[PDB]
Amino acid sequence: SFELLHAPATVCGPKKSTNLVKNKCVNFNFNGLTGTGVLTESNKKFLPFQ
Amino acid sequence: TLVKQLSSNFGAISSVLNDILSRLDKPEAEVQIDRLITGRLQSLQTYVTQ
C-alpha cells in the first residue's frame, strides 16, 4: 500500500541524481515532482517544514 | 475559472497529466488522460462561449 502524497518521500526508487543547471529551461524531477521550466533562486522565506 | 478547472480531476486518478503518464502504462493512461481531455475541452468550450 502506497501513499502518493506531497509530503517528503520516505521511500525512493533505485535512481541516480544529477546536478542542477539553473537559469535554463530544463526537464526536472524532484522526488517524483516533474515538469519543464527554468529553475532560479527564489529568495523566498519558506517555513522550516515546507 | 478557466485556470482553476485544470486541477478539477474530471473522474481521473489525478489532475496532473505527468503523474498519470509517469504512473500508468500506455493502455491505462490513455483512459485517464481521455477523461481529463473531455473535461478540459468542455471547460474551454464553456469559456469561449461565454
How many angstroms separate the CA atoms of A12 and A2, rounded? 12
- Exposed / middle / buried, residue B20 (Cβ in 10 Å: 0-12, 13-18, 19+): buried
Method of determination is cryo-EM
Distances (CA, A) of B14 to B9, B19, B48: 6, 7, 25
Which are the contacts of B18, defined by CB distance < 8 A and separation ≥ 6? A34, A35
Is A35's CB within 8 Å of B22's CB?
A: no
Pair A23, A40: CB distance under 8 Å: yes
Using CA atoms, how far apart are residues B40 and A38, in angstroms rounded to an integer?
26
Q: Are B42 and B6 in contact (CB under 8 A)?
A: no
Minimum CA–CA partner of A28 in chain B: B18
Please name the amino acid found at residue A7: A
CA gap B20, B12 in Å, rounded: 9
- Please indicate whether, in this complex, the C-beta atoms of A35 and B18 are within 8 angstroms of each other: yes
Neighbours of B12 (CB within 10 A): 21
Q: How far apart are CA B32 and CA B10, in angstroms?
A: 9
Three-state DSSP class for residue A30? strand
Phi first, then psi: give them for residue B38, nearest 5 degrees.
-60, -45
Copy the grid coordinates of residue B15: 489532475
Q: Smallest Cα–Cα separation from A9: which of A29, A36, A38, A35?
A: A29
- To one decimal, the resolution in angstroms is 3.2
Residue A32: all three cell numbers together: 517524483
